């Protein structure tokens, strides 16, 4: 704070910055200053960020990233093949 005031604010930036932060879902009239109006009404957490579709806890089902759930018992063997082949290439990409 002292050195940048001497330097007449022209500040050479910090090289690296990595940080985690934690956001709390509030109705987002409550994140703005005290004033008897508002511009935003919804919650601060996005609807995608309060429910990702996830792989089901049972082994007998498989849930895809779009919401198309598949059991292990209603598959055909040729559809069993492609899904193991699809989860092959996504796992191998990492």
């Amino acid at each position: 704070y002292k050195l940048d005031v001497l330097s007449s604010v022209h500040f050479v930036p910090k090289p690296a910055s990595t940080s985690l932060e934690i956001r709390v879902e509030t109705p987002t009239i409550s994140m703005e200053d005290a004033q008897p109006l508002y511009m935003s009404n919804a919650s601060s957490l996005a609807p995608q960020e309060i429910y990702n579709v996830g792989k089901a806890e049972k082994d007998g089902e498989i849930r895809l990233k779009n919401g198309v759930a598949m059991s292990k018992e209603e598959l055909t063997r040729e559809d069993k093949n492609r899904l193991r082949r699809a989860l092959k290439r996504k796992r191998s990409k990492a």
Binding site: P27, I29, S30, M31, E32, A34, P36, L37, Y38, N41
Partner: protein
């Protein structure tokens, strides 16, 4: 003659007029009062600021002035005002019909002397009292006793004796008795002016022949006498510094100083005031100080000082001649043409028949200066042609000023009376500009204008020619030739595109100025004396010789308004700052106020002195008039800035309130079909829908610290069954009887949003469901009226947050669903805006993007 728009503020630019100023002493400082006609002024003597002007105009001219310490004694026609701080605090009326010539104060007494040789005495009613109020007695002087009264003086150390000086001789009156204790001998000359002396028992005397006579009262003899060649003595004063000095002020403008010890004159001042306007009307050495204050009748007031002597040992013999010190100036003559200088109404140029332009100040009255007339030495190198005895410029009849480029070159163009050229003036340097503008066809300059950019200077000759000189170099650029008679007004529009001109041949020619083409040409009936353009709206007004103002649009090239009602020549006029008025003054001694929308006068002011010029401020506040008699500038305060103004043609009487006060309140609702909103703020829907979220963010982060001893009933402590039910439920209940809710819903509008959540949560309905079913029937009866469509649906929605648990569990009751079907039978009609907004959205998105 009371106006509705204007009211006089004060008259600007006057200092004195000829009535002798009288000085008063506060502590060690000195104040000079003067007078201006019917309204006197007060000047400090240490820097000559304006300190106090009187609150009202007097009904006639102030004839004589005097001032004892705080109280200024002013004497107009029949009465004597005793004024403090310019406020009339006690009016003293003299019981004659004669007019009061002279006035004097000493002791408990006031001494006023009317013109018919009668002297009135007014006593302090109490020695605690400050101004004398009670009529004591009437002293008279018959003509066998003495002549007409020259003055009243009270000499030092005389118990109630009043030295009455006359044209013949000198009297003494003991005003307690009322008796003539001593009369002097008769003087061979007519006495003009008397003044006391700082020595004992001596009054000084002044004759019409040049003789000053010292006169003793204890011996009753003439001690010393001073002869003056060829002068009428008008003022006398003694320096009280400790050096004997007499100042004789002539009526031929001379001020003459004597040294009574050495019996010699010291230095004689020549023409410190004009001989014609009266010479030195009053001169006074300030007490114990080397400062003499001279004030003539030619509207000035000057101070002169004596420097200390250059001799070390000699001193009183080698006397420095007097020296010019500060002064104030006004026009000696009435002003011919004025203008305003700037937007904040802070300077006014005023050029008069005294031949000397002045930049008066509306703001602070010691800031006013004569613009110098001292010609710049030429760029070219050849010498300037002019008479070596420098005389002032001929008087100024047309002025133009555009303030846009000030301080870098000239911005004031003035046209002098009967000169084939027309000079320029810088505003900031207060000086004649270096360029002079010629007409190149040997015609007199009758009208000038400047471009708004401040680069071009228009000159309208009296032979048609409109030469356009540039303003850096004074070089000639373009010469326009349309008129054949005298051009009497030019202007350029705000965009610097189009140019108008008006002639005495009736032609109003419309020029282009970017190109040099004539756009068009309009001919009216009469010859045209003057033009005022209004650059904000491209309207300009003409003054014709058939006594009508014609207002012509500058774009559409046709007469828009024509104003009849004058009865003699229109002198000058000006638009309002917003183009809504025209105020014109004419030789019918009127000042009218035209109204451009409705085309008629709305105010007619009969002033006895005819008004030569009327100029608005560029700001919307002041109106300045210049009359024919008088010297200063009357300033009118605009009531229209503080009050709406009726627009009626009232002038014919002396000589739709929507439209009259030119404002329109909206309907509450057009027709019974149309949905509306609530009158007032648009946040009332949002705060009713989001009152719980707003209060959860409004609170502080942490808990405030309390003390444990708190009054539980603190809110009630503020120091200054059905009857126990609140006024809302009782008005609902009486509304439930007559099956009507029009008075109920008028209460629900006027609750606070804080009240409404406390109210609808209190609806007391568990088993019977009266109060819910009554409240729904209020809202259905609301939307049938279509008023306040925003709020009643939010009162509907606020039920379902507060009681939506309740009416759901008690769904399919025939009493609630009777109301809710009566809701839905009403609520279906107001889909017709939801089918209206989507068309209003989806088109306007399609139109602006695609």
């Amino acid at each position: 003659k009371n106006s509705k728009i204007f009211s006089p503020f004060r008259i600007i630019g006057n200092v004195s007029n000829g009535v002798p100023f009288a000085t008063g002493t506060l502590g060690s400082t000195f104040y000079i009062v003067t007078c201006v006609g019917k309204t006197f002024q007060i000047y400090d003597a240490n820097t000559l600021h304006l300190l106090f002007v009187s609150e009202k105009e007097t009904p006639s001219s102030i004839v004589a002035l005097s001032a004892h310490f705080h109280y200024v004694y002013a004497a107009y026609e029949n009465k004597v005002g005793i004024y403090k701080r310019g406020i009339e605090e006690h009016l003293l009326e003299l019981e004659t019909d004669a007019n009061v010539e002279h006035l004097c104060i000493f002791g408990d007494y006031l001494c006023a002397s009317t013109d018919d040789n009668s002297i009135f005495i007014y006593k302090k009613s109490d020695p605690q009292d400050k101004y004398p109020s009670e009529f004591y007695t009437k002293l008279t002087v018959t003509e066998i006793q003495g002549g007409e009264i020259v003055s009243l003086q009270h000499l030092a150390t005389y118990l109630n004796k009043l030295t009455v000086v006359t044209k013949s001789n000198v009297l003494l009156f003991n005003v307690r008795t009322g008796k003539l204790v001593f009369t002097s001998n008769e003087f061979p000359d007519q006495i003009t002016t008397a003044e006391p002396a700082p020595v004992l028992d001596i009054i000084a005397l002044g004759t019409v022949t040049g003789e000053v006579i010292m006169f003793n009262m204890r011996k009753g003899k003439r001690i010393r006498t001073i002869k003056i060649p060829q002068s009428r003595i008008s003022s006398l004063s003694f320096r009280t510094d400790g050096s004997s000095h007499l100042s004789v002020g002539t009526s031929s403008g001379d001020l003459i100083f004597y040294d009574l010890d050495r019996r010699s004159r010291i230095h004689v001042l020549k023409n410190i005031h004009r001989e014609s306007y009266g010479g030195v009307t009053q001169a006074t050495f300030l007490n114990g100080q080397p400062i003499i204050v001279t004030s003539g009748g030619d509207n000035s007031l000057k101070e002169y000082v004596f420097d200390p002597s250059l001799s070390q040992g000699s001193g009183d013999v080698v006397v420095q001649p007097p020296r010019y010190l500060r002064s104030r100036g006004g026009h000696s003559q009435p002003p011919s043409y004025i203008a305003f200088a700037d937007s904040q109404s802070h300077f006014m140029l005023s050029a008069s028949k005294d031949r000397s332009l002045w930049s008066f100040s509306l703001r602070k009255d010691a800031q006013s200066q004569e613009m110098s007339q001292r010609l710049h030495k030429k760029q070219d190198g050849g010498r300037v042609g002019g008479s070596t005895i420098k005389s002032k410029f001929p008087e100024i009849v047309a002025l133009a000023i555009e303030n846009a480029r000030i301080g870098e070159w000239e911005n004031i163009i003035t046209a002098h009376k009967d000169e084939k050229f027309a000079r320029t003036w810088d505003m900031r340097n207060k000086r004649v500009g270096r360029w002079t503008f010629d007409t190149t066809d040997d015609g007199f300059v009758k009208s000038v204008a400047m471009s708004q950019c401040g680069n071009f200077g228009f000159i309208g000759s009296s032979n048609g020619s409109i030469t356009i000189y540039n303003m850096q170099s004074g070089i000639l650029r373009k010469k326009y030739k349309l008129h054949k008679r005298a051009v009497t007004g030019i202007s350029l529009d705000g965009m610097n595109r189009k140019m108008v001109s008006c002639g005495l041949d009736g032609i109003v020619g419309f020029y282009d100025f970017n190109k040099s083409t004539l756009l068009g040409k309009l001919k009216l009936d009469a010859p045209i004396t003057a033009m005022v353009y209004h650059r904000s709206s491209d309207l300009f007004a003409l003054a014709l010789d058939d006594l009508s103002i014609v207002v012509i649009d500058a774009v559409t090239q046709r007469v828009v308004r024509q104003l009849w009602g004058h009865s003699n020549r229109i002198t000058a006029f000006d638009f309002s700052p917003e183009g809504r008025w025209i105020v014109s003054a004419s030789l019918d001694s009127t000042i009218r106020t035209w109204d451009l929308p409705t085309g008629g006068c709305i105010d007619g002011i009969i002033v006895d002195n005819v008004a030569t010029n009327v100029k608005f401020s560029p700001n919307g506040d002041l109106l300045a008039t210049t009359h024919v008699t008088g010297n200063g500038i009357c300033i009118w305060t605009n009531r229209a800035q503080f009050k709406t103004v009726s627009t009626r043609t009232i002038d014919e009487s002396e000589f739709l309130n929507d439209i009259d006060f030119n404002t329109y309140t909206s309907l509450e609702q057009i027709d019974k079909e149309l949905l509306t909103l609530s009158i007032g703020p648009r946040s009332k829907m949002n705060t009713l829908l989001h009152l719980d979220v707003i209060r959860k963010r409004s609170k502080p982060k942490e808990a405030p610290k309390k003390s444990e001893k708190l009054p539980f009933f603190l809110q009630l402590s503020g120091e200054k069954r059905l009857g126990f039910e609140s006024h809302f439920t009782k008005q609902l209940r009486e509304g439930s009887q007559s099956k009507d809710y029009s008075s109920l819903l008028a209460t629900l509008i006027n609750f606070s949003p804080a009240a409404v959540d406390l109210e609808i949560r209190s609806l007391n309905s568990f088993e019977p469901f009266d109060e819910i079913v009554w409240f729904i029937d209020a809202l259905t009866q609301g939307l049938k009226s279509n008023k306040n469509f925003e709020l009643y649906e939010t009162f509907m929605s606020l039920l379902f947050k507060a009681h939506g648990d309740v009416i759901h569990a008690n769904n399919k009751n025939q009493d609630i669903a009777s109301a809710l079907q009566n809701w839905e039978d009403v609520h279906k009609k107001e889909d017709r805006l939801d089918d209206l907004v989507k068309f209003c959205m989806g088109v306007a998105a399609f139109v602006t993007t695609a």
